Amino acid sequence: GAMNSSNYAELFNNDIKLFVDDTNVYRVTVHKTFEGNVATKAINGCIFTLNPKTGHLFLKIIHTSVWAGQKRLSQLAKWKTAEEVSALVRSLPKEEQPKQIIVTRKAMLDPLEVHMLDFPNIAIRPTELRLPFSAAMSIDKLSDVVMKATEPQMVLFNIYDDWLDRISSYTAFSRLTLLLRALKTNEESAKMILLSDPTITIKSYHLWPSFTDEQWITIESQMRDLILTEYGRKYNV
Amino acid sequence: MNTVPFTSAPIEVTIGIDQYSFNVKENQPFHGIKDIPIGHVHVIHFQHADNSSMRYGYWFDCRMGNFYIQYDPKDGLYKMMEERDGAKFENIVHNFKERQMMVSYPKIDEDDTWYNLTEFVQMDKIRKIVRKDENQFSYVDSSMTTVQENELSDPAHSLNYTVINFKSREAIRPGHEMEDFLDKSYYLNTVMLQGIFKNSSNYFGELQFAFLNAMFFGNYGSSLQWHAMIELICSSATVPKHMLDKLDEILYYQIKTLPEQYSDILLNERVWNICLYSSFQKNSLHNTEKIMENKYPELL
Numbered sequence: 077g078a079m080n081s082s083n084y085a086e087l088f089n090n091d092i093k094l095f096v097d098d099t100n101v102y103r104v105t106v107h108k109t110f111e112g113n114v115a116t117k118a119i120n121g122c123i124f125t126l127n128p129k130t131g132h133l134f135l136k137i138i139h140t141s142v143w144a145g146q147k148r149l150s151q152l153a154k155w156k157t158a159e160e161v162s163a164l165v166r167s168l169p170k171e172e173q174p175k176q177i178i179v180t181r182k183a184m185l186d187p188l189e190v191h192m193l194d195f196p197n198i199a200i201r202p203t204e205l206r207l208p209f210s211a212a213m214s215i216d217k218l219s220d221v222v223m224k225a226t227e228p229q230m231v232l233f234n235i236y237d238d239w240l241d242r243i244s245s246y247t248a249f250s251r252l253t254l255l256l257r258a259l260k261t262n263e264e265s266a267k268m269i270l271l272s273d274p275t276i277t278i279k280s281y282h283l284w285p286s287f288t289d290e291q292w293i294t295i296e297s298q299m300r301d302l303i304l305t306e307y308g309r310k311y312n313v
Numbered sequence: 314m315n316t317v318p319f320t321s322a323p324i325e326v327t328i329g330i331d332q333y334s335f336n337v338k339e340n341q342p343f344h345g346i347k348d349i350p351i352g353h354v355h356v357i358h359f360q361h362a363d364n365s366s367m368r369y370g371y372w373f374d375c376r377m378g379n380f381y382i383q384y385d386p387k388d389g390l391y392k393m394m395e396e397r398d399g400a401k402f403e404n405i406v407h408n409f410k411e412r413q414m415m416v417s418y419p420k421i422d423e424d425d426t427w428y429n430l431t432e433f434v435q436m437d438k439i440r441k442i443v444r445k446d447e448n449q450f451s452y453v454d455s456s457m458t459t460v461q462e463n464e465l466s467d468p469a470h471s472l473n474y475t476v477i478n479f480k481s482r483e484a485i486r487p488g489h490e491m492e493d494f495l496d497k498s499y500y501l502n503t504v505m506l507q508g509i510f511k512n513s514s515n516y517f518g519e520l521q522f523a524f525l526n527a528m529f530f531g532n533y534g535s536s537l538q539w540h541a542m543i544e545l546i547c548s549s550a551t552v553p554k555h556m557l558d559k560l561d562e563i564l565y566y567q568i569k570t571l572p573e574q575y576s577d578i579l580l581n582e583r584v585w586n587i588c589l590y591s592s593f594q595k596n597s598l599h600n601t602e603k604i605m606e607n608k609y610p611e612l613l
């Protein structure tokens with residue numbers, strides 16, 4: 077059934093599961109044409125497929141060539157997503173395949189379920205959580221590899237860096253969702269928070285800065301402030 | 314014009330014969346139904362006055378044998394039986410007709426309703442949906458479940474309708490996922506019509522039988538089957554033109570005949586709005602769309 081706050085620790089048990097977010101698959105810029113009409117120009121996108129327990133991110137880059145000559149692109153994008161999750165699961169060894177796939181948008185249910193009819197023991201589930209995975213393209217290294225791609229490509233990341241050496245997957249996921257919620261509510265401020273101090277760097281093999289435990293508490297507090305504020309500035313409170 | 318005699322009417326019952334119905338009182342001198350039109354299947358059905366629970370009845374074709382009804386006080390229902398002695402039967406019916414103890418099948422000459430509801434329904438196909446091979450007639454009641462209902466519990470008492478499931482490996486070919494799910498023409502024309510039903514007449518016959526079991530017995534699995542067989546056609550971009558035209562006629566007479574006070578339970582809002590206003594065939598069911606809009610505008 078649907079995934080919500082009542083069953084949130086299920087994300088961190090030992091049944092393999094993946095979140096799939098399709099919000100960055102089909103991306104466009106809207107512009108005026110010479111005749112004064114409006115047109116879209118597609119830009120590269122990505123499927124965000126994440127194991128919340130391990131931090132493993134399977135980032136399938138969606139090159140704009142996949143839309144050439146196609147109609148109804150917003151609908152095709154959901155089916156393309158489903159077909160991409162389907163090949164990924166099929167390439168994994170049986171003991172690595174997920175027991176559940178959780179889609180962040182309900183319109184992905186039928187495409188993914190039709191694509192995995194020959195995988196009946198994998199549960200396809202919605203969620204009631206409003207997860208901020210759309211903000212993945214505000215992570216500089218992820219955005220860079222998507223925009224530079226000249227062909228379809230899968231890139232593998234650990235979105236938790238090395239955090240699991242010191243914290244649990246519950247805490248890592250909570251940190252991730254806080255960082256992404258911040259980046260989604262006010263990207264400039266969030267990014268200022270994360271890099272204000274030049275002495276803290278991002279390792280070449282990491283996505284986020286190398287904060288100590290104490291610095292993460294500071295950072296996490298600053299992100300909460302950002303989010304509560306913006307929510308004032310937004311709602312005037 | 315054939316006859317279905319009754320041994321007696323020991324319990325008070327509302328009796329249906331096709332789209333007609335009449336009340337019989339407890340121990341009233343009632344000995345059956347005469348002037349039944351030859352050439353069509355028929356259904357004779359029952360609702361006891363003391364227990365409206367379980368409508369039940371029998372599909373039959375008078376060309377296939379001499380059938381009568383007899384109440385069974387042990388099992389508590391009116392049972393259809395076949396009389397194999399032709400001379401005994403003729404003699405029984407002649408006596409009951411002479412004493413005017415039979416209701417006349419009350420068909421108006423202008424009226425093609427029953428033909429229109431049963432055009433493609435054949436007894437031989439009914440007997441493959443309702444398996445009881447020792448009888449020439451078929452029992453159906455309100456509670457009977459379908460084979461597909463049982464996959465989601467006595468198999469001998471099931472309705473073996475053709476299983477339709479839009480999210481299944483039969484309905485979807487590997488590599489044609491989005492195509493086959495959004496346009497069901499493959500599933501309609503190749504899997505079902507060419508492969509399973511053989512022709513559209515048999516498909517329409519099962520569709521019509523499903524509707525009639527839904528209407529006459531409140532059989533929920535039959536209603537599900539009727540709507541699925543409609544949705545499968547409406548959700549196909551490629552349908553033979555003669556099939557669309559005939560479907561419109563079939564559904565028109567089903568909607569015309571449906572009791573107005575049963576529309577809430579016998580019509581699925583989602584299926585009908587999708588079929589009439591969103592589907593590939595949204596512009597192909599003129600007669601059906603017009604009667605639906607004038608009779609059940611609330612559903613839509």
Ligand SMILES: c1ccc(OCCNCc2ccco2)nc1
Pocket residue numbers: 159162163166190191192193194481482485486487488490
């Ligand atoms: C990309 C790679 C392989 C592949 O295999 C076909 C499995 N698709 C599921 C399904 C529906 C009906 C039957 O099987 N599909 C897409």
